[PDB]
XYZ file of N, CA and C in Angstrom:
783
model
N -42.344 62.068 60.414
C -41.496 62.387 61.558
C -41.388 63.898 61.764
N -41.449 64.627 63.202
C -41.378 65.604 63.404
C -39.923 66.688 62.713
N -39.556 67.610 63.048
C -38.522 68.393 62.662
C -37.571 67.681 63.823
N -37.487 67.758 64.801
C -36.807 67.480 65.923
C -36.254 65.724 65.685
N -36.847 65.166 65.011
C -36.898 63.854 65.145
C -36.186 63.354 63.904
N -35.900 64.089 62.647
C -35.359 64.241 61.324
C -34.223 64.500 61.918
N -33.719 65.910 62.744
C -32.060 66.027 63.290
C -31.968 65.515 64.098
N -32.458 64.521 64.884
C -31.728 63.758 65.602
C -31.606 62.111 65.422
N -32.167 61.981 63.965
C -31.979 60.709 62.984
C -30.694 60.681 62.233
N -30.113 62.508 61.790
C -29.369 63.293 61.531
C -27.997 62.856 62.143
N -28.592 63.529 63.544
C -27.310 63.081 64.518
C -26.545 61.964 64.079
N -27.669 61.089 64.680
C -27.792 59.580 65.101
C -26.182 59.252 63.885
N -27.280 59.388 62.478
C -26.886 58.860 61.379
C -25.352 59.418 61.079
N -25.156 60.837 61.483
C -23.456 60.788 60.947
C -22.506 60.616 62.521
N -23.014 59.863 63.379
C -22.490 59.063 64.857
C -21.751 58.052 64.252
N -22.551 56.968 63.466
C -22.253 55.327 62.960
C -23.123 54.647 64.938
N -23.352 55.175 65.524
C -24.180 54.379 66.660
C -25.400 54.555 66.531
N -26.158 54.398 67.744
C -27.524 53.764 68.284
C -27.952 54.916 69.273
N -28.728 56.257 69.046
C -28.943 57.228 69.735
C -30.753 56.929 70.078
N -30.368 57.072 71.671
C -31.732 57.151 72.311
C -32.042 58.451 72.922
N -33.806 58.718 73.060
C -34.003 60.360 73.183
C -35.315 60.288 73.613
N -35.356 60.867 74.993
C -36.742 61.029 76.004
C -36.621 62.057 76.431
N -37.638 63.348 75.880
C -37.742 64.632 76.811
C -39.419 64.713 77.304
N -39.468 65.149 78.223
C -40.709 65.196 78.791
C -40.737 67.103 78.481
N -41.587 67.802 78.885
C -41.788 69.180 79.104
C -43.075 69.225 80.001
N -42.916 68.610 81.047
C -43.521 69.330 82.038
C -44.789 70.465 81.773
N -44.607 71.712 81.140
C -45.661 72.189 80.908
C -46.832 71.814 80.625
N -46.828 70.795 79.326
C -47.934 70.143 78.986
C -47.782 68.948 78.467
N -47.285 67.811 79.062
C -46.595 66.580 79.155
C -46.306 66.024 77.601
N -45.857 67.422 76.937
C -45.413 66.601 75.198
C -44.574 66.269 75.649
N -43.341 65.190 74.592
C -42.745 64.336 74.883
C -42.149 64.442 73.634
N -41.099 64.235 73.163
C -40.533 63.868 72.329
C -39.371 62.873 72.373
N -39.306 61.545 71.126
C -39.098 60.439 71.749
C -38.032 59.898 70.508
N -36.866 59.603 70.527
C -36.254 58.997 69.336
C -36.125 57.677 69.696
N -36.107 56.493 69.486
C -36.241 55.015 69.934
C -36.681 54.824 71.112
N -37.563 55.902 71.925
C -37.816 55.944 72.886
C -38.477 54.516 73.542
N -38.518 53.336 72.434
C -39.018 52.339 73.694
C -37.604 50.932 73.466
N -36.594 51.299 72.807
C -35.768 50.632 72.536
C -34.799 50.760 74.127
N -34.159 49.242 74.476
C -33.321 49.090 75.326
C -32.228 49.459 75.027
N -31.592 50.222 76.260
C -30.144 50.761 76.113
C -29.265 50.259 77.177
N -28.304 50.090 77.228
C -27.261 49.649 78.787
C -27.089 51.133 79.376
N -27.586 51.128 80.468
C -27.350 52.280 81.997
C -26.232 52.802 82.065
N -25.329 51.521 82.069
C -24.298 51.849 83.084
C -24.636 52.691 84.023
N -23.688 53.919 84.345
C -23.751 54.515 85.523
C -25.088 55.283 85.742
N -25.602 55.528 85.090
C -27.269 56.327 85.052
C -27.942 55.206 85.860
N -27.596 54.013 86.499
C -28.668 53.530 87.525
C -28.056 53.344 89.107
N -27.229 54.551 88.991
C -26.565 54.964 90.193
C -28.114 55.751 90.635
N -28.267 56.198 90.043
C -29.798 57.071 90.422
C -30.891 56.303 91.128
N -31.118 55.423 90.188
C -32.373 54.484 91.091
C -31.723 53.541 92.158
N -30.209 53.327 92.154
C -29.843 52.953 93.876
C -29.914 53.823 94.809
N -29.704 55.714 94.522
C -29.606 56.012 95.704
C -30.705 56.654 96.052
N -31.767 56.696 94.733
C -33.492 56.858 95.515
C -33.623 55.490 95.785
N -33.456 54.310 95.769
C -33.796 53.297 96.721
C -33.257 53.429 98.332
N -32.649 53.603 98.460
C -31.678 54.312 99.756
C -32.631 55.353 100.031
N -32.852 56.599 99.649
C -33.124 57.715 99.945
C -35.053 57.243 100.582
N -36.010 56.243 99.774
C -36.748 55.657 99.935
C -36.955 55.208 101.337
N -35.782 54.062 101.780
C -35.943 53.855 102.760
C -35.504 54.649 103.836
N -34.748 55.514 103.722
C -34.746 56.786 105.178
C -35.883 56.924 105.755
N -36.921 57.109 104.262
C -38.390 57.589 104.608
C -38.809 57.328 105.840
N -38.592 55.725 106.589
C -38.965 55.180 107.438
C -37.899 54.876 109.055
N -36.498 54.843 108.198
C -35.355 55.067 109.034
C -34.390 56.149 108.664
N -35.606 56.977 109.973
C -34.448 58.452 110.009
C -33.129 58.923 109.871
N -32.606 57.879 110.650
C -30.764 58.289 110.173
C -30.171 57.202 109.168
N -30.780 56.772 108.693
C -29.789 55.757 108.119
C -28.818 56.376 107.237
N -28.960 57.947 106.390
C -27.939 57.927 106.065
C -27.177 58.760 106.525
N -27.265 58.752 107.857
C -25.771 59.089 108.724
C -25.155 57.010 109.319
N -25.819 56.487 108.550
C -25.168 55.388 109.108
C -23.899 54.820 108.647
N -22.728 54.641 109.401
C -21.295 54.222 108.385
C -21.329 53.279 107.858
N -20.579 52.801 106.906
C -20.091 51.790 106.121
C -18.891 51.191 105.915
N -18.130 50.205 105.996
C -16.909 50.131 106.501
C -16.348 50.051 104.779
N -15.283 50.313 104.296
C -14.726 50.399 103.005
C -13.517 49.353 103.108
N -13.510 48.080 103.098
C -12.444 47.497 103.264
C -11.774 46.987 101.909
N -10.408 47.068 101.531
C -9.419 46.796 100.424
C -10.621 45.755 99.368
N -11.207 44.856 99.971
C -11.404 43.667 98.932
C -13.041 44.372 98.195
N -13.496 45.263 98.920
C -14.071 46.273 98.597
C -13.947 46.910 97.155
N -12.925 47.447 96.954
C -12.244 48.484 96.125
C -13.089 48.128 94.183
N -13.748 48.659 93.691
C -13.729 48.222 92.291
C -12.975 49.453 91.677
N -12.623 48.752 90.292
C -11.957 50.281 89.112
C -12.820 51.723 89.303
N -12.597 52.925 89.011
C -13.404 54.203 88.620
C -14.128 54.255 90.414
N -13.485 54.099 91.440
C -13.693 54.747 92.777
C -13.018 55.400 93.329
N -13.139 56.470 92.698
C -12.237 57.992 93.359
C -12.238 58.080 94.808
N -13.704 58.249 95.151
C -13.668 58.881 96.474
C -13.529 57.649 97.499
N -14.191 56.182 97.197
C -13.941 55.145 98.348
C -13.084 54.643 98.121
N -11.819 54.838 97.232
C -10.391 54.645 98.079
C -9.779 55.586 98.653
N -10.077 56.693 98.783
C -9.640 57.636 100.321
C -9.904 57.129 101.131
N -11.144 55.843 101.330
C -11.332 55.904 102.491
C -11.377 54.486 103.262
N -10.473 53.440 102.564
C -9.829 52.434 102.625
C -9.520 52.245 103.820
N -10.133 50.869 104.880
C -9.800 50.589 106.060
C -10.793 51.801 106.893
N -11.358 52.399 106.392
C -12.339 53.129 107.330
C -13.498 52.912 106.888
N -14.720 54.376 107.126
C -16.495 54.420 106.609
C -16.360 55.337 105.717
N -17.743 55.372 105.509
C -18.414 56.200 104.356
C -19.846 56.563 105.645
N -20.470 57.222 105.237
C -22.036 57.196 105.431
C -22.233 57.086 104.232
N -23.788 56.264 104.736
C -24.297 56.290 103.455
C -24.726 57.570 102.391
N -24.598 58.528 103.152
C -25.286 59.929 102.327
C -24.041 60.142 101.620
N -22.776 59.938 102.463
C -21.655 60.146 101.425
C -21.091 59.386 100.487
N -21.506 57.931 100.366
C -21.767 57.241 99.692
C -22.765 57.159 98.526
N -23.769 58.196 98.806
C -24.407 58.120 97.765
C -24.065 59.535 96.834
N -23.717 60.427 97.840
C -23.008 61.648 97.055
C -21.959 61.231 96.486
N -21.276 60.575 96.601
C -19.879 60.029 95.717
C -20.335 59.007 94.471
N -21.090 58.197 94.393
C -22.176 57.384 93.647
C -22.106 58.374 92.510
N -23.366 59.367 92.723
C -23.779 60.501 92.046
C -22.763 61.772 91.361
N -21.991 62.125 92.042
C -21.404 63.351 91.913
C -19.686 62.655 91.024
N -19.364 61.875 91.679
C -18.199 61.736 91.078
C -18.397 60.076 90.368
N -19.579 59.011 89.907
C -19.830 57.723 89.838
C -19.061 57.236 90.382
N -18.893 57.014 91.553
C -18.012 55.988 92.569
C -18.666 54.625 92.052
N -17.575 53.692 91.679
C -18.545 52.264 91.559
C -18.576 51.348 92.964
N -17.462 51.741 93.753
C -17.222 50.947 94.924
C -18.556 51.457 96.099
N -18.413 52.822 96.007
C -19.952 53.474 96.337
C -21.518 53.025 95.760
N -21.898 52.801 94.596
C -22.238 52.179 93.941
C -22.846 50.667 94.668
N -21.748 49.749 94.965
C -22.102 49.008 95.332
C -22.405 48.657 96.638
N -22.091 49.455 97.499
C -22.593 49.566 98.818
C -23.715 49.720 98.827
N -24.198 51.025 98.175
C -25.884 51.199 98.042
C -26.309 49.709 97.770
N -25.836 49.392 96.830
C -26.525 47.702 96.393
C -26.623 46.964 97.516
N -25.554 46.828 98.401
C -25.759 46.197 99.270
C -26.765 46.581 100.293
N -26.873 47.510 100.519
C -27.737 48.388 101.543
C -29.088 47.649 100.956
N -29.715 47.842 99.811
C -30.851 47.334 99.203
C -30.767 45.930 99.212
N -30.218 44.768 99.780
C -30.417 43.419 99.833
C -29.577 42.977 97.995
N -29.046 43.170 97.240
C -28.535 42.887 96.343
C -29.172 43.617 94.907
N -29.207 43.752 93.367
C -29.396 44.275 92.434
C -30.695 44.067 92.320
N -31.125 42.559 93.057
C -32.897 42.893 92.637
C -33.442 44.111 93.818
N -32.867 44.193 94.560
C -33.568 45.371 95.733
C -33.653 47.206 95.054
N -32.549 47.005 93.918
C -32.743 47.663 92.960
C -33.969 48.238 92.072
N -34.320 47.283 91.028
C -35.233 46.695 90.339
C -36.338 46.704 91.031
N -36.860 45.962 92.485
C -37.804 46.169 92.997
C -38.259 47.816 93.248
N -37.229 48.457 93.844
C -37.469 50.211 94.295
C -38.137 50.684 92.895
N -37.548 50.538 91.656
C -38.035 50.864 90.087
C -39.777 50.570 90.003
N -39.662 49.128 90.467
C -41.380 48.384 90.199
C -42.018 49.188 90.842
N -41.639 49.343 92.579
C -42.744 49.857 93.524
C -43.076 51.484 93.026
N -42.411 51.937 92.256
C -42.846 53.274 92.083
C -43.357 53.520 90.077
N -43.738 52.076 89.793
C -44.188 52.329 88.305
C -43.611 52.167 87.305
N -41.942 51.964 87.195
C -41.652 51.768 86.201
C -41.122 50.121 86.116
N -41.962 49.779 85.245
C -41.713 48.218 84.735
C -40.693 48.226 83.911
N -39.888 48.523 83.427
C -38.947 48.461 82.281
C -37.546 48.441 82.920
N -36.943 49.752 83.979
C -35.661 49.352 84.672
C -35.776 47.832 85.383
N -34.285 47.258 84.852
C -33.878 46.057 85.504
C -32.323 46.229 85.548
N -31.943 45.933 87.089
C -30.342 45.798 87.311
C -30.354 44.698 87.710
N -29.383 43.952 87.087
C -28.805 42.087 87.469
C -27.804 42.427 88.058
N -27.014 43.162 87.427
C -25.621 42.842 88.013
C -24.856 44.181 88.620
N -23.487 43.888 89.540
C -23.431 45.025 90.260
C -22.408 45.251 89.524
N -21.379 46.472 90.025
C -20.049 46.778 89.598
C -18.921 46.447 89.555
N -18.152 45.872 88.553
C -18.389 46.636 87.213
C -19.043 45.795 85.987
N -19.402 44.706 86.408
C -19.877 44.307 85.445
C -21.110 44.469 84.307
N -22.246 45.299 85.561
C -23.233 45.928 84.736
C -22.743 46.770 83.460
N -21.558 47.328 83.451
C -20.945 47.843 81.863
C -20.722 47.197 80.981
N -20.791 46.065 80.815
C -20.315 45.367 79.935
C -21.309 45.776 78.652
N -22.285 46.420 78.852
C -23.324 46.778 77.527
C -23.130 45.784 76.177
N -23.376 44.899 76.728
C -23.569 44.142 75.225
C -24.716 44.427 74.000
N -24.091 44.286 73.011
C -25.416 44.844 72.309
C -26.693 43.335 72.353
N -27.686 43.882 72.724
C -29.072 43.316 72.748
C -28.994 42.300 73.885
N -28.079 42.490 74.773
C -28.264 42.090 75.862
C -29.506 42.699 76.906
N -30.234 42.221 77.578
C -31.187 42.782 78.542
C -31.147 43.124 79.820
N -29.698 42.784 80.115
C -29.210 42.823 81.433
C -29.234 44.140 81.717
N -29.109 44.966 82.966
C -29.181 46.790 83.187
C -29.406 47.393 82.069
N -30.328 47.518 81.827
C -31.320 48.239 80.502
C -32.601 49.037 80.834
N -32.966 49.950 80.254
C -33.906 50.550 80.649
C -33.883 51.053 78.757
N -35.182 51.700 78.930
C -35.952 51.976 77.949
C -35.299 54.197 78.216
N -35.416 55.135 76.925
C -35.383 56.173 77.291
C -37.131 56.766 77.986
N -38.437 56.014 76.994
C -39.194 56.537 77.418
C -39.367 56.329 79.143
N -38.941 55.180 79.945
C -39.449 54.725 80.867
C -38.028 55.442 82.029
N -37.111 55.876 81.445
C -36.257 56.320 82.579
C -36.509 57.688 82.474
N -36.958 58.326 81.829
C -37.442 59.743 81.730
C -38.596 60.058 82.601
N -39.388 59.554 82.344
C -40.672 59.139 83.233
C -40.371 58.838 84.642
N -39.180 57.898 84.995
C -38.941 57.409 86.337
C -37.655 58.949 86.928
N -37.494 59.560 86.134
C -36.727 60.621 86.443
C -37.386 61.653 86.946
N -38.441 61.910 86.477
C -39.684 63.163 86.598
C -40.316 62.566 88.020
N -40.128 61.335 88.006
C -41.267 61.019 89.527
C -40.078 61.073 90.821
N -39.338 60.800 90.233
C -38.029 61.191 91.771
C -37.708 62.692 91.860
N -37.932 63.844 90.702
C -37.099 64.410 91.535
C -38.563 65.786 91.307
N -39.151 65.699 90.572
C -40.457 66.584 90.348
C -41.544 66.304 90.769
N -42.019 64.370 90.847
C -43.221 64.213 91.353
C -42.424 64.025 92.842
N -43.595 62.484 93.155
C -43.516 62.448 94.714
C -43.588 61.125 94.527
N -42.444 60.321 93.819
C -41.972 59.041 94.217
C -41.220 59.070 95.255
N -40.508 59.956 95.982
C -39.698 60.177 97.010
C -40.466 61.403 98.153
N -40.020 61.074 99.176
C -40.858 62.171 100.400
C -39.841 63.724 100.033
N -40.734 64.639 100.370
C -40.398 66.128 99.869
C -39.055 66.137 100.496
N -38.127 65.519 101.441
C -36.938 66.100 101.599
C -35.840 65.210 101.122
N -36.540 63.537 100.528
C -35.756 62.644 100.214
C -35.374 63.542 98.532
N -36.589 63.776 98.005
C -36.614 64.670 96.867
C -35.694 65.804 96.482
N -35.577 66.750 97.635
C -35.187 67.707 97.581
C -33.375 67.279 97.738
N -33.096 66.452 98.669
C -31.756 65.771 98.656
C -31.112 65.209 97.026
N -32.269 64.456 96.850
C -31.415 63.583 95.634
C -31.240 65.176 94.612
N -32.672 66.094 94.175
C -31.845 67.344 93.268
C -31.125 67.559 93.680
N -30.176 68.116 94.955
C -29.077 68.823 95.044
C -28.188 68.087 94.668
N -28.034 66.623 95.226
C -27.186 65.949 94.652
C -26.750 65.790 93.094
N -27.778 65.684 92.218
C -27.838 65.980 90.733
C -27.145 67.422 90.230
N -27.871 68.151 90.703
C -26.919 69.853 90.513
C -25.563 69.641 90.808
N -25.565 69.113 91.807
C -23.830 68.831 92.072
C -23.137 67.910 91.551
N -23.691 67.026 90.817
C -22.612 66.261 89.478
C -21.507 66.866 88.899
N -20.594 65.888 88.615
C -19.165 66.719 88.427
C -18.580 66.453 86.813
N -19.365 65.221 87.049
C -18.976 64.486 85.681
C -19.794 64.875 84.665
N -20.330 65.581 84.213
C -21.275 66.073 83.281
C -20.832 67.180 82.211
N -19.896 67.802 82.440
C -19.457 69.355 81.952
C -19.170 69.102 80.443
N -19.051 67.734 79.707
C -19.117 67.831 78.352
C -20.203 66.875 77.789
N -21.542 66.732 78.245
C -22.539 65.787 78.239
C -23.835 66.836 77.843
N -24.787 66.439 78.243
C -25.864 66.912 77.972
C -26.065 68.722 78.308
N -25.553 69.464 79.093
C -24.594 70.401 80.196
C -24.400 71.480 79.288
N -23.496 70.064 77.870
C -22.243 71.383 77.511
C -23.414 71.822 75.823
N -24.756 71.649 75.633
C -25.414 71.665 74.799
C -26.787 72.628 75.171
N -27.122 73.150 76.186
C -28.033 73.659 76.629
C -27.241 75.273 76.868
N -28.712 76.112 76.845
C -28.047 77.768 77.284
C -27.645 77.656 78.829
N -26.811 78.486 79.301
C -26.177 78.702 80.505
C -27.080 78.759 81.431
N -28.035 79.634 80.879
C -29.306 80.167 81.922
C -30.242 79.111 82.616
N -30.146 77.882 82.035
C -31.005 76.863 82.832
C -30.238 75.845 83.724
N -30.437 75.849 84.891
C -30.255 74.988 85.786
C -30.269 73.518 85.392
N -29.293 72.592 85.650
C -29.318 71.964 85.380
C -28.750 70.375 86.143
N -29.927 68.995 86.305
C -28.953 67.973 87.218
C -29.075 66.817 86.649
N -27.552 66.448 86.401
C -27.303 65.359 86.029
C -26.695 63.751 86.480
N -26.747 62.854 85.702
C -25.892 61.571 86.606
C -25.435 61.366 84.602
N -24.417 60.971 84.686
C -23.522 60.183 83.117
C -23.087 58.268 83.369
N -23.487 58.242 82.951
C -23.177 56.655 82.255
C -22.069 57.011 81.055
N -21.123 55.769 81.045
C -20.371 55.251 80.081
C -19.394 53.548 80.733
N -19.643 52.915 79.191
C -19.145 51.731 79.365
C -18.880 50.978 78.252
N -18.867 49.743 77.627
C -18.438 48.919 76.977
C -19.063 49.273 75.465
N -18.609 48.921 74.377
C -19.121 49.746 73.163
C -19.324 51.300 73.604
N -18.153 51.619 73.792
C -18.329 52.935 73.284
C -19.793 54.172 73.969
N -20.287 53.339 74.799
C -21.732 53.289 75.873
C -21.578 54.638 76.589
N -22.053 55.967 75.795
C -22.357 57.146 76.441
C -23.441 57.785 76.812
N -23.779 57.952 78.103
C -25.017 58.252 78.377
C -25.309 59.535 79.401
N -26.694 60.345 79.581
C -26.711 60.967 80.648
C -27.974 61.336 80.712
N -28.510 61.507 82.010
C -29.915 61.677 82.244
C -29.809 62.938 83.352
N -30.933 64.020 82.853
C -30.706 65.404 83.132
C -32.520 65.898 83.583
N -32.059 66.562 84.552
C -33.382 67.292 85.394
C -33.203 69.066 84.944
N -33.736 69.607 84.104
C -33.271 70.670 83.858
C -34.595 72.178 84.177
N -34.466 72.895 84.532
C -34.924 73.949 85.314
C -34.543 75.325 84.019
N -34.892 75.705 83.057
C -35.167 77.248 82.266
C -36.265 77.949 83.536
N -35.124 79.424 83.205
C -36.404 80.653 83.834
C -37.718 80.934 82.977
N -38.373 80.873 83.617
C -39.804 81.258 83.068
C -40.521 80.409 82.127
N -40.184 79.210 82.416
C -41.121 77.810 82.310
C -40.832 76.793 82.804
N -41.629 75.856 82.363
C -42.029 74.428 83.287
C -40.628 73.942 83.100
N -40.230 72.794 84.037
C -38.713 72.377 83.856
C -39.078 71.200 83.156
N -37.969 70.595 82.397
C -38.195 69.686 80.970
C -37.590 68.378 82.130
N -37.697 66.903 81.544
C -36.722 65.976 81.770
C -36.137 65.142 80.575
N -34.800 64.738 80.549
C -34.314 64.630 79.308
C -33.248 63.549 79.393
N -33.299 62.596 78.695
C -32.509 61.310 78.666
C -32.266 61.156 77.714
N -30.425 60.939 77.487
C -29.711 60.869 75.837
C -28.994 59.377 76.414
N -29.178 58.595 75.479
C -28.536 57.474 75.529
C -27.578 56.765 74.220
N -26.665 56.287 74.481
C -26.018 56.521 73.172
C -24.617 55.661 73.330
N -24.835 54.331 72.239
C -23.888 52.633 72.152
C -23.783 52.830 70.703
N -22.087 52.211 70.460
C -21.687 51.819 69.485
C -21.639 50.550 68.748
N -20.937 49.709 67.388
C -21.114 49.041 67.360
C -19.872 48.240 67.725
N -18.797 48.749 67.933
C -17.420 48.287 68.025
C -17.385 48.359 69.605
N -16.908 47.421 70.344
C -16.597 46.986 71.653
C -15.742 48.226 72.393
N -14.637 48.536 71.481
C -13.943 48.920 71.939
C -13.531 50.760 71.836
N -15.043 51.069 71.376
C -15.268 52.281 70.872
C -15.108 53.517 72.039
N -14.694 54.383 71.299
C -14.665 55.655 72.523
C -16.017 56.167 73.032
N -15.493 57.144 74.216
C -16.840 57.926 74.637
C -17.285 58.985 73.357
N -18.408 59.471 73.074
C -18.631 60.214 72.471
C -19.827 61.378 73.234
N -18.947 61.969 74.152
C -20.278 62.752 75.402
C -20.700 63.777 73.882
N -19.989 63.958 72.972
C -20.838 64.874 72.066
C -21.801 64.916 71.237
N -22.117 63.225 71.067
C -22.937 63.266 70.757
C -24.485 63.561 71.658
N -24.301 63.744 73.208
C -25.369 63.985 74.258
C -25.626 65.332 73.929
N -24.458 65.934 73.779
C -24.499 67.793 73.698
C -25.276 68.176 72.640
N -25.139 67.568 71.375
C -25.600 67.476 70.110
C -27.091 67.473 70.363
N -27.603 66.187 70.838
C -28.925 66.062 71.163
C -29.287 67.157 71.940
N -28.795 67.063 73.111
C -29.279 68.238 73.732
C -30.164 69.265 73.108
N -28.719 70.284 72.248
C -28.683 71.353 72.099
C -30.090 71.140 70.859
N -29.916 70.186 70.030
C -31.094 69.897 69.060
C -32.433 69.452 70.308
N -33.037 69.355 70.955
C -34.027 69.503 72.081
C -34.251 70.982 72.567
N -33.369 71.423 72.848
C -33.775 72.695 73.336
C -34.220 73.749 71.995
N -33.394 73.400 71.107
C -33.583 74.610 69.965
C -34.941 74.188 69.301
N -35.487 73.069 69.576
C -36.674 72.619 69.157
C -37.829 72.691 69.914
């Protein structure tokens, strides 16, 4: 096992959880991988592949996301900051998906779902662009339930790292659907003690965070250093107790052990 791969067995090991670890480096497509083909629960990290499914189809319908959405009471799920402001009125979808992203709206969240024909319209957007491994069944909030060795909203780190690099670096998305979803990532709010709070200041950085059932802390990061290739980097990270806390430090941890490596 590499040096990098010893401290973050390290990590892992004085956690008591289940740490997953996908960095790409862009420069010259090394990779470094800790259970990288082991299933993890999403949770909120597949807010991402709903709103490049969305962002996908603009490709073809220009305004759709100036199109409204009506937010009605029976609407409402737990952890929706921004779509209960807006209760008995719309959203657009762009602001719907900025609220998704930036603050994990789940009630937002599921609109996108709906927009895509239900969770397989999800899953399909994942297939059509290569990655076989994301699958979303279920919508919000139940996709948290992260059971352990359940298969339900799971993705692999090697295969969401990979599907991360083609949305916002390659050209799984058209150059301005692209350029939308990074800003949106830079502008994440929820990140500041995650993967964020483990990297030097100097690199740019965009994120989406997952957390849910066991203790289920996660975050997947598009990151930009001056004067080289930009890396992509997915920390995933379940406990064994149901009722376990967040642990965003252990993301920082990894992190900071990725970069110093």
């Amino acid at each position: 096992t590499s040096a990098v791969q010893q401290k973050l067995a390290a990590l892992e090991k004085s956690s008591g959880g289940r740490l997953g670890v996908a960095l790409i480096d862009t420069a010259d497509n090394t990779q470094v991988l800790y259970r990288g083909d082991e299933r993890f629960p999403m949770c909120s990290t597949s807010k991402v592949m709903a709103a490049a499914a969305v962002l996908k189809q603009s490709e073809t319908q220009k305004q759709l996301l100036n199109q409204p959405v009506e937010i009605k009471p029976a609407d409402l799920v737990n952890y929706s900051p921004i779509a209960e402001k807006h209760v008995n009125g719309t959203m657009t979808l762009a602001e719907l998906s900025a609220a998704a992203l930036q603050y994990s709206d789940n009630t937002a969240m599921n609109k996108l779902i709906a927009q895509l024909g239900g969770p397989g319209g999800v899953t399909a957007f994942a297939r059509a662009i290569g990655d076989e491994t994301f699958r979303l069944d279920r919508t919000e909030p139940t996709l948290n339930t992260a059971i352990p060795g359940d298969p339900r909203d799971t993705t692999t780190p090697r295969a969401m790292a990979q599907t991360l690099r083609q949305l916002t670096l390659g050209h799984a998305l058209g150059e301005t659907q692209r350029a939308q979803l990074v800003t949106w990532l830079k502008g994440n709010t929820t990140g500041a003690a995650s993967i964020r709070a483990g990297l030097p200041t100097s690199w740019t950085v965009g994120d989406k965070t997952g957390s849910g059932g066991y203790g289920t802390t996660n975050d997947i990061a598009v990151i930009w250093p001056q004067g080289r290739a930009p890396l992509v980097l997915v920390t995933y990270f379940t406990q064994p107790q149901q009722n376990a806390e967040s642990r965003r430090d252990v993301l920082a941890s990894a992190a900071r052990i990725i970069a110093e490596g």
